[PDB]
Structures are given as C-alpha cells and as structure tokens.
Structure 1
Amino acid sequence: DLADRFAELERRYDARLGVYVPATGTTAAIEYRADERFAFCSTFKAPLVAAVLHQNPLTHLDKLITYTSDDIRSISPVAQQHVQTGMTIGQLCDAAIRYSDGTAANLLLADLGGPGGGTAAFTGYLRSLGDTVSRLDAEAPELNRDPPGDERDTTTPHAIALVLQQLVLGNALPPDKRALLTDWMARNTTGAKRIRAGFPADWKVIDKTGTGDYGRANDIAVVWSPTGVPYVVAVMSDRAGGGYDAEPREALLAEAATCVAGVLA
C-alpha cells in the first residue's frame, strides 16, 4: 500500500517519483521506480566532491584556483563573488554542495579529468563505486536540460542511494575525507523544504539537492534517528508531461520523505 501511497503522490502532483532507501540490518529496503532513469541535476556534486577528495591528499584542498567572470555559465552563488580573489579546491567543494554552485562544480570537473573530460572522469568514479548505470555527459547548467528519455546525465534512485551509501556510511572514502563530505552536506542550505521537511526535528539530516527542466526536483540524503541509526534516502522526481518549463515541486519530495519517515520512525 506504500507503493500505492507513492502512486497517489504521483497523481496529486502530476509527476513521476522515484525512491530508494537501502535495506539495513534491521529494516527492509524501500523502492519505488528505483531502477528507472532520473536526471542527476545537481545531485552529482556530492559524489563529484568525493571523487576529488578520494583522488588527492587533503593538502590539495589548499590549492588556489583562479577563473574569470566569463566562466560563470550557471547559477553560482559563491563563485561570482570571488572572481578577483579565486577559490580553493576545498572552497569549491564547500560551494558545490552547500550552495549548489554550478561554476564550482564545473571547476571541480576540470580538476577531476581536465577541461574536456571532467564528465568522463566523473562517470569513471561512479564505475569505481559499482555504479554501472549512471552517466554524466555535460556540465552545469546543460546537465539539467536533457529531454525525457535521453539517458545522458541520468542515474537511478537505486544507483545514487547506494553510491551515497558507500560514501557517507561505507568505506568508499577514508574516514577523515568521509567526515569532510559529511560535514559539508550537513550544512547544506538548499534543502530545508525537501527530505528535511519530511522528517521530525529530532532526526538529523544531511542532503544535497537537484533541480532542472521538465519539473525535475531531486534530493539525496542520509538521515540519523534520535538514537543515532543511519539511513540513506534518495528521492527523485520530474513533471515531464507538463513541458520543459514544468514547475519543480519541493513539496512532492518532502511528502515522499514523510511517507519514508513513517516507515522508519
């Protein structure tokens, strides 16, 4: 009937919705359209940071990166205030997650595999984590703007939840780098009205958001129960049938999170 509850959420918001909460030692897996393709949108910036953290020592986060005002080709809340000063790799990581800064992500993509193959190196990092399905084929903001059915810049709720499972709670990152990717997500400022709004206050939530064309609204997250038990929650959605300019619905993501919270609370 929970599958019917999500199916009712789709009818109410006239949307497609995908949910995956991986099974734990004490809870079963929640899955709804978890093997269908949804666009990454900006959700890829948390594993992007992990790729950069993984491939480089911590001192690499002190490397100063300079750029121009002509590099700002997407919504970049932080990068467009520091053109004259330049931003550090850590500062780019801090901005790519907490403010979903598109230029910061585009810079970290270039840091990953050079100017041309940042998207190809990011996909390879997902291939290194056991993701055989996810692919990134453009940088911000073009990765938000593929038509429905195009596999470019898409992952699945099942895939990204397992990747984030490895990154925050698993062994994909050394614990000191793990704590850094966790801390930045813990202070994300873009997702107060998504999964965080579907969980009660005593639950701790870290997340990274995603928004795009065709009503795309996503949110991947790890939550902690008041007793400290962790869960991965990946929620993805789009309202494709309404056109490329369909309004994303953050409420659809928090109602879906409320349904999940009812299963885990």
Structure 2
Amino acid sequence: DLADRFAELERRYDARLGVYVPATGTTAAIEYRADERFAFCSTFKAPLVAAVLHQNPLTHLDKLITYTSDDIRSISPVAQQHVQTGMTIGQLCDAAIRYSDGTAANLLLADLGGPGGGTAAFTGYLRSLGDTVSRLDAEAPELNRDPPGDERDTTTPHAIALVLQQLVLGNALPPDKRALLTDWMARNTTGAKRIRAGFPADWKVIDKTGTGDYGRANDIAVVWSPTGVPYVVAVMSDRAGGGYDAEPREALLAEAATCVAGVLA
C-alpha cells in the first residue's frame, strides 16, 4: 500500500511528505498530504519563467539586464559570474531553471514587475491558471525562511502539479514558448538525486527542484514512459522537527519517486 510506504518514509526521515500525481487515462491520481501547504522554495521558478515568456514577445529573451553587487543576496552560481557584463532575459531564465539561480529569479520577478517586486504578478499568473491556492509573498532569500505552518510563499503538491501539467502538457503557453520551458527543465542540473533517481533510465524526466530551511526539499517533474506516456509528479518535504537548520534529505524524494515509479510502470 502506497500510503503506508509514504508514512514509513516520513518516520525514517523525521519528515512531513507530500505527493501528487494527477489522474490520467488509466491511472488514478496519486495523493499523500497533497492538499497540505509546503513552501515553494525554488520550485516557483518554473511557473515564473512561464510567466515571463507568456508576458513578452519571444525576442524579449535577447534583452540585456544589468545588476550590481547588492543584488547578490542568495545562492546564484551563474549571476555572480556576470555582474559586470549583465545577463539577457534568456540567460536569466536558463540560470533560474537549470542552476536555480536566486539572483536570476529575483531579476525575472522584477522584469515581470508590479507590486511586491513582481510577487503579486507572479501570484496573478497562477490565478490565471486556475490555481487559487498558491501564493508568493517574498523573493530570495526570504521566501525559503517562513516558519513551518506559515502560509506565506506556499503551494501544495496538488496545486503545483496541476500548474506544471498546464505549462508542459497543456496549452498555457504557445508551442514555441512551451518548448523553451520544457527544454530548460530537461537540461536541469540540480535534480539528479530526486525524482530522476526514482525512475528507470528509459523514462524521460524534466524537473525543477527547491531547497529551503527547516529541512525543505521539493522536486516537481514531468516524466514520460518508454512509450511516450506522460505523468506529472510533485514531491514536497520538510523536517520541522530539526528546526531552522534541519538538513534537507534528497534521499526521501528519491525513495518517494521510486514508490511512484513502481505504481506507474
């Protein structure tokens, strides 16, 4: 039984685990704590890039964005290396997804614009996709630090899975913008020990991870069977019991994904 397996993993990792896989042709939705709130962490960058793409002509990707020393306030493996030169919107989208670059995402929020440095427009974008649950209230680094239980900067496995489904498999974006988002997630560098670790090599996996305080570790993916049948997989976790400095545990997400893959095979 899946729910028993997910509950075992919670005990093993002293964690709270949430899982959602939306229903398909012949598979029932998989759900475990799927309607409980968990912090977005960096997972918001997938819908953020979709918002920026949707909002502008495709050649907005070529616009140069400049920023300064004081814009670097979070883990930013790419943007730290380009303060002098600036970075194009395309480069920022690439870094935000593939390296989970925090400065890149902050700049993309500012590009999207409006109150809260773009957090309100980001949240409005989710509303336009029928997501009445998720909310973004702060940018990096603040968005990863909300106390366990606090609703700021949260989504649910259920809400984010339905959003990702529309973005990658549905018609939220035109085909050209959709392919840009899909390709970036396909080329993600941060995801190898999460959902990817739970599916066999002949399944395609694209994803966006998030990590935060209180042992937060998330991964949202779209996967395709060896015959091209797609499934959306959202896994979210925290370890409130270890306090603010609780270590995130990727292995928990790998094991949860392995369990899901077992059902979907």
TM-score, scaled relative to structure 1 = 0.99
Q: How many residues were matched structurally?
A: 265
Q: How far apart, in 1, do the equivalents of 2:155 and 2:114 lie?
A: 23
Aligned-residue identity in percent: 100
Q: Is 1:60–2:60 an aligned residue pair?
A: yes
Q: How far apart, in 1, do the equivalents of 2:213 and 2:34 lie?
A: 20
Q: How far apart, in 2, do the equivalents of 1:242 and 1:116 lie?
A: 31
1:68-106 Cα offsets, whole Å, 9 max, x none, are 121001000000101111100010000000000000000
Aligned counterpart, 2:19 = 19
1:9-34 Cα offsets, whole Å, 9 max, x none, are 10111100000000011211100000
Q: Is the 8 A contact 2:116 2:138 kept in 1?
A: no
Secondary structure in 2 matching 1:257: helix
Alpha-carbon shift at residue 182 of structure 1 (Å): 0.1
Q: How far apart, in 2, do the equivalents of 1:91 and 1:118 lie?
A: 19
Alpha-carbon shift at residue 155 of structure 1 (Å): 0.3
Alpha-carbon shift at residue 117 of structure 1 (Å): 3.5
Q: Is the 8 A contact 2:145 2:212 kept in 1?
A: yes
Aligned counterpart, 1:225 = 225
Alpha-carbon shift at residue 114 of structure 1 (Å): 4.3
Alpha-carbon shift at residue 115 of structure 1 (Å): 7.2
Q: How far apart, in 1, do the equivalents of 2:66 and 2:206 lie?
A: 29
1:106-144 Cα offsets, whole Å, 9 max, x none, are 000000114743111100000000000100000011100
Q: Is the 8 A contact 2:220 2:233 kept in 1?
A: yes
Alpha-carbon shift at residue 241 of structure 1 (Å): 1.3
TM-score, scaled relative to structure 2 = 0.99
Q: Is the 8 A contact 2:66 2:86 kept in 1?
A: yes
Q: Is the 8 A contact 2:114 2:120 kept in 1?
A: no
Alpha-carbon shift at residue 167 of structure 1 (Å): 0.1
Deviates more, 1:25-34 or 1:92-101: 25-34
Q: Is the 8 A contact 2:116 2:137 kept in 1?
A: no
Deviates more, 1:21-30 or 1:107-116: 107-116
Alpha-carbon shift at residue 195 of structure 1 (Å): 0.2
Secondary structure in 1 matching 2:73: coil
Q: Is the 8 A contact 2:42 2:209 kept in 1?
A: yes
Q: Flag the 1:176–1:46 CA change in 2: closer, same or farther, 3 A.
A: same
Q: Is the 8 A contact 2:219 2:234 kept in 1?
A: yes
Q: How far apart, in 2, do the equivalents of 1:264 and 1:149 lie?
A: 31
Secondary structure in 2 matching 1:117: helix
Q: How far apart, in 1, do the equivalents of 2:149 and 2:6 lie?
A: 22
Gaps in structure 1 of 5+ consecutive residues: none
Gaps in structure 2 of 5+ consecutive residues: none
Q: Is the 8 A contact 2:137 2:153 kept in 1?
A: yes
Alpha-carbon shift at residue 165 of structure 1 (Å): 0.3
Aligned alpha-carbon RMSD (Å): 0.8
Q: How far apart, in 2, do the equivalents of 1:42 and 1:211 lie?
A: 7
Q: How far apart, in 2, do the equivalents of 1:84 and 1:117 lie?
A: 23
Aligned counterpart, 1:36 = 36
Q: Is the 8 A contact 2:115 2:121 kept in 1?
A: no
Secondary structure in 2 matching 1:205: strand
1:134-164 Cα offsets, whole Å, 9 max, x none, are 0000001110000011100000000000000
Aligned counterpart, 1:202 = 202
